[PDB]
Amino acid sequence: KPQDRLFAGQIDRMDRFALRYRARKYSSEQFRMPYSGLRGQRTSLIPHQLNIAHDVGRRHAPRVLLADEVGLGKTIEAGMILHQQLLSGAAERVLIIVPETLQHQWLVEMLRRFNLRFALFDDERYAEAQHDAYNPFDTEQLVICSLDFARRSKQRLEHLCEAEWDLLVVDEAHHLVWSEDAPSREYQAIEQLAEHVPGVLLLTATPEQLGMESHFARLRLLDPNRFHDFAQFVEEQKNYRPVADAVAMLLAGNKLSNDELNMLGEMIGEQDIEPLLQAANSDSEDAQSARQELVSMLMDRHGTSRVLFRNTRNGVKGFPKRELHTIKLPLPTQYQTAIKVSGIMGARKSAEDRARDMLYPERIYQEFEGDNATWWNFDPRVEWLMGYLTSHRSQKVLVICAKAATALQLEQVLREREGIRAAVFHEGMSIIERDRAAAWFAEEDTGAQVLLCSEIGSEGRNFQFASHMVMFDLPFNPDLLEQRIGRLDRIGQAHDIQIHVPYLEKTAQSVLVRWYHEGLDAFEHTCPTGRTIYDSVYNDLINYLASPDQTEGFDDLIKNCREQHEALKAQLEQGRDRLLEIHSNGGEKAQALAESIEEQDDDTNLIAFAMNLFDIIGINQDDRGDNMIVLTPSDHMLVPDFPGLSEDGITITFDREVALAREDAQFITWEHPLIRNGLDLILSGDTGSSTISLLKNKALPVGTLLVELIYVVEAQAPKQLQLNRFLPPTPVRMLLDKNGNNLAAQVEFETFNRQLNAVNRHTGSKLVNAVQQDVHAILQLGEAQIEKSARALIDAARNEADEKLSAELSRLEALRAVNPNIRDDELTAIESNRQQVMESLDQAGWRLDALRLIVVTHQ
Ligand SMILES: Nc1ncnc2c1ncn2[C@@H]1O[C@H](COP(=O)(O)OP(=O)(O)OP(O)(O)=S)[C@@H](O)[C@H]1O
Numbered sequence: 001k002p003q004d005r006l007f008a009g010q011i012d013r014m015d016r017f018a019l020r021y022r023a024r025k026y027s028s029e030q031f032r033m034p035y036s037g038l039r040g041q042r043t044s045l046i047p048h049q050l051n052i053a054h055d056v057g058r059r060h061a062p063r064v065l066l067a068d069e070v071g072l073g074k075t076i077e078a079g080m081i082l083h084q085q086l087l088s089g090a091a092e093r094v095l096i097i098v099p100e101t102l103q104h105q106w107l108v109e110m111l112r113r114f115n116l117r118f119a120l121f122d123d124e125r126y127a128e129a130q131h132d133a134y135n136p137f138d139t140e141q142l143v144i145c146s147l148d149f150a151r152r153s154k155q156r157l158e159h160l161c162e163a164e165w166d167l168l169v170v171d172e173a174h175h176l177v178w179s180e181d182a183p184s185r186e187y188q189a190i191e192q193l194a195e196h197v198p199g200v201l202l203l204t205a206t207p208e209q210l211g212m213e214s215h216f217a218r219l220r221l222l223d224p225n226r227f228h229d230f231a232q233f234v235e236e237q238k239n240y241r242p243v244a245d246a247v248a249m250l251l252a253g254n255k256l257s258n259d260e261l262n263m264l265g266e267m268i269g270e271q272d273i274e275p276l277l278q279a280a281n282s283d284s285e286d287a288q289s290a291r292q293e294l295v296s297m298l299m300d301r302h303g304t305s306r307v308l309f310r311n312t313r314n315g316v317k318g319f320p321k322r323e324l325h326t327i328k329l330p331l332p333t334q335y336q337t338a339i340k341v342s343g344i345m346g347a348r349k350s351a352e353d354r355a356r357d358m359l360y361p362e363r364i365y366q367e368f369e370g371d372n373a374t375w376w377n378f379d380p381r382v383e384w385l386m387g388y389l390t391s392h393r394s395q396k397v398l399v400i401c402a403k404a405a406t407a408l409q410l411e412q413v414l415r416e417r418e419g420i421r422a423a424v425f426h427e428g429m430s431i432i433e434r435d436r437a438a439a440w441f442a443e444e445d446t447g448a449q450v451l452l453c454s455e456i457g458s459e460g461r462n463f464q465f466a467s468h469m470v471m472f473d474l475p476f477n478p479d480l481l482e483q484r485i486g487r488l489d490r491i492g493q494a495h496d497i498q499i500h501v502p503y504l505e506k507t508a509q510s511v512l513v514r515w516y517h518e519g520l521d522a523f524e525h526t527c528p529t530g531r532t533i534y535d536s537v538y539n540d541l542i543n544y545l546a547s548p549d550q551t552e553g554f555d556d557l558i559k560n561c562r563e564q565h566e567a568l569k570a571q572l573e574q575g576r577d578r579l580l581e582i583h584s585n586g587g588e589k590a591q592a593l594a595e596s597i598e599e600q601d602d603d604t605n606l607i608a609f610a611m612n613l614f615d616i617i618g619i620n621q622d623d624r625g626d627n628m629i630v631l632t633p634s635d636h637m638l639v640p641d642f643p644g645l646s647e648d649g650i651t652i653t654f655d656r657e658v659a660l661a662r663e664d665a666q667f668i669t670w671e672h673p674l675i676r677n678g679l680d681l682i683l684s685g686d687t688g689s690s691t692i693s694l695l696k697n698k699a700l701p702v703g704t705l706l707v708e709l710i711y712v713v714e715a716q717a718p719k720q721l722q723l724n725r726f727l728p729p730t731p732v733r734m735l736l737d738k739n740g741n742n743l744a745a746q747v748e749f750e751t752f753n754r755q756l757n758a759v760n761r762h763t764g765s766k767l768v769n770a771v772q773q774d775v776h777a778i779l780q781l782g783e784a785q786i787e788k789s790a791r792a793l794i795d796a797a798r799n800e801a802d803e804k805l806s807a808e809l810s811r812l813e814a815l816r817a818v819n820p821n822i823r824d825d826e827l828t829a830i831e832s833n834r835q836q837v838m839e840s841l842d843q844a845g846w847r848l849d850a851l852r853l854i855v856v857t858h859q
Pocket residue numbers: 042043044045046049068069070071072073074075076077171172203458459460461462490491
């Protein structure tokens with residue numbers, strides 16, 4: 001086929017032939033990496049996240065509950081699972097359903113960290129998409145919508161169910177509450193969705209102790225066969241508590257009681273168990289190893305760890321300390337008058353509404369003096385903010401308030417008074433507008449030195465050098481408070497977080513500061529008890545907020561809440577399942593997984609191929625020297641529009657640490673779309689498949705003919721079978737003389753390619769037609785040589801495919817014997833996939849892809 005094009009007049013350029021071979025060779029090599037799908041994401045390599053992603057991401061139709069605590073990376077873990085299944089072909093269509101306020105968070109995270117462009121489906125986008133198909137969700141492969149959107153219409157819900165999704169992601173799944181007599185519409189929608197999508201990821205950090213019926217109902221959504229009875233599940237969790245405590249004491253060091261181990265041995269039921277148990281419970285020279293084998297066999301028999309992952313902050317340390325600094329300020333008489341007239345108008349207004357309103361006195365003032373009324377003239381919080389920023393000009397400060405209107409007013413007064421420039425975040429801006437404001441604030445280069453945020457939820461952007469936070473006001477519930485602090489209290493952040501709270505005395509602000517700090521300790525330590533206690537004392541705490549002058553019993557309430565907080569906190573830590581924690585973080589095997597990816601990171605093959613790829617496609621690279629390159633298209637582009645480019649130009653980097661510091665830059669790996677789209681572009685057609693060249697070599701007779709043939713050995717099969725793990729389309733380069741000697745083993749490609757020069761068209765065409773009959777005789781000589789070569793590759797693959805898939809099949813069958821969380825369809829998927837892989841490798845052959853004729857000259 002390629003020689004027919006050559007003898008018919010197609011002569012390709014030298015760089016096209018070379019790049020075609022290189023791109024096929026590197027594609028063949030990068031597919032077989034054991035860590036594919038975990039390299040391309042713009043994240044740090046945290047072992048507990050990679051352990052979850054590497055386990056769940058390679059399953060057939062994964063159905064797990066991701067229950068890591070707040071800030072531990074549930075969005076990143078879900079993104080890594082999506083990244084693998086989409087890259088490998090195991091999934092094609094993904095549906096992410098989140099609370100309405102977290103939609104933009106997931107769009108930014110999935111695009112800027114995993115290169116996944118999701119489509120937000122709201123009511124206006126839904127009506128737009130209806131014009132194109134019967135099912136409007138068929139118009140996009142990756143969509144995000146809200147719980148309210150999914151539940152609102154039965155007809156729209158049916159379309160969402162029949163849209164043939166491969167993976168379903170539900171964030172903040174604790175919003176799905178089990179109710180025996182009145183399940184919410186959003187519960188019913190997710191329940192129906194979960195029966196129609198094979199792969200489901202439920203995300204919620206809620207402890208099962210704060211609600212057990214809902215926790216079991218979420219697990220039953222994942223596997224209704226295993227989790228079929230609630231009372232049985234409750235009894236299982238009770239029966240297991242002594243085992244988790246005895247195990248916890250083991251790793252803690254204190255040795256075990258006689259009856260405490262025959263209880264570990266009963267749950268690990270097997271005949272010869274005494275030697276291992278005694279070796280572990282000895283603290284000898286062998287006990288260190290003996291416990292890893294012990295807990296390993298206990299994790300395989302754990303009742304829920306196969307489908308439930310829960311890392312904790314006490315288990316995975318690495319979060320910064322949080323320091324509270326309160327600043328009590330006098331109440332100006334303008335607010336005194338505004339509050340009084342407000343109380344005269346709201347004698348009937350509910351205590352709940354009065355409590356919330358008086359938290360933001362600039363809104364009370366404007367509600368009587370008009371919008372944009374000059375409250376910033378007398379508000380002492382503004383003056384304190386002025387003095388703090390003017391005396392801290394070299395550090396990045398993040399200021400948060402509830403309302404955008406207040407945040408936008410602060411930007412103006414701070415600019416008009418002290419000349420300080422501030423980036424602003426609020427819900428009224430576009431994602432791209434917030435992208436610029438973020439990059440402006442991220443500059444250590446006299447960037448924006450203060451970032452002003454409304455209550456808008458964080459979109460995952462990392463501000464490395466930001467460790468100082470000002471709460472201009474306080475949010476109304478403790479869940480919003482931790483979301484605020486989480487903007488800087490990030491994993492891997494080393495500097496202590498300074499939280500400054502300027503507040504007005506004897507107002508609802510002063511009451512809320514006391515309750516958050518003294519009652520919940522919510523500022524300096526992450527609060528797992530806030531919501532639970534807040535619900536119990538809501539209409540009680542509201543009264544003290546609404547009437548800050550009458551403080552009778554407030555100290556008693558604070559005492560009540562703090563004692564309940566401390567008790568619930570310590571109880572959650574006692575019930576912490578250490579065996580579940582170890583399975584969640586992955587131990588030393590996960591640390592090795594993190595090291596292996598970081599070693600693979602610095603890829604000189606990639607930089608080489610990427611620059612060779614961009615020259616041919618026609619991209620102009622401007623190396624800014626700072627580990628960053630600016631890509632701008634040129635005139636001589638192959639395709640008019642190459643996917644990832646814009647006429648404004650994009651910034652790229654190959655270094656993972658630079659990519660984390662500059663999220664405005666593309667993180668180029670073998671798994672980046674720019675690379676995968678460039679590979680497919682040059683390997684799609686026939687460009688570079690047929691050419692002729694001259695070799696200036698005096699050590700060889702004039703006119704001697706060599707042909708270098710690029711064969712490709714491949715099987716044909718659907719991508720979901722994942723045949724590329726064992727036999728991707730693989731090039732087999734041969735270099736033949738007139739007798740058929742294969743010299744490719746002693747003639748390195750790049751060394752020999754640098755000596756082959758193109759021919760002008762008129763001489764080149766004359767030369768090809770002259771040597772044709774000899775070339776045909778050499779082509780016939782190769783067909784026998786490629787056969788033995790291709791048969792060695794296929795037989796190598798079908799043995800490696802049979803060996804790998806036998807291990808996976810045996811591993812899942814060993815688990816099913818001791819674990820109830822192995823689904824029937826999982827065992828059938830491996831058994832069927834293995835048989836189909838063997839059958840596709842049986843029908844694998846060879847073809848000639850490209851050939852380059854070489855004629856020796858002395859000129
Ligand atoms: N490996 C990582 N590398 C870089 N940033 C990370 C990593 N893991 C987490 N982050 C950031 O830390 C923050 C917390 O991540 P999340 O996954 O959202 O935390 P989460 O609380 O477990 O999940 P939700 O859905 O937000 S409640 C985000 O700003 C992430 O971008």
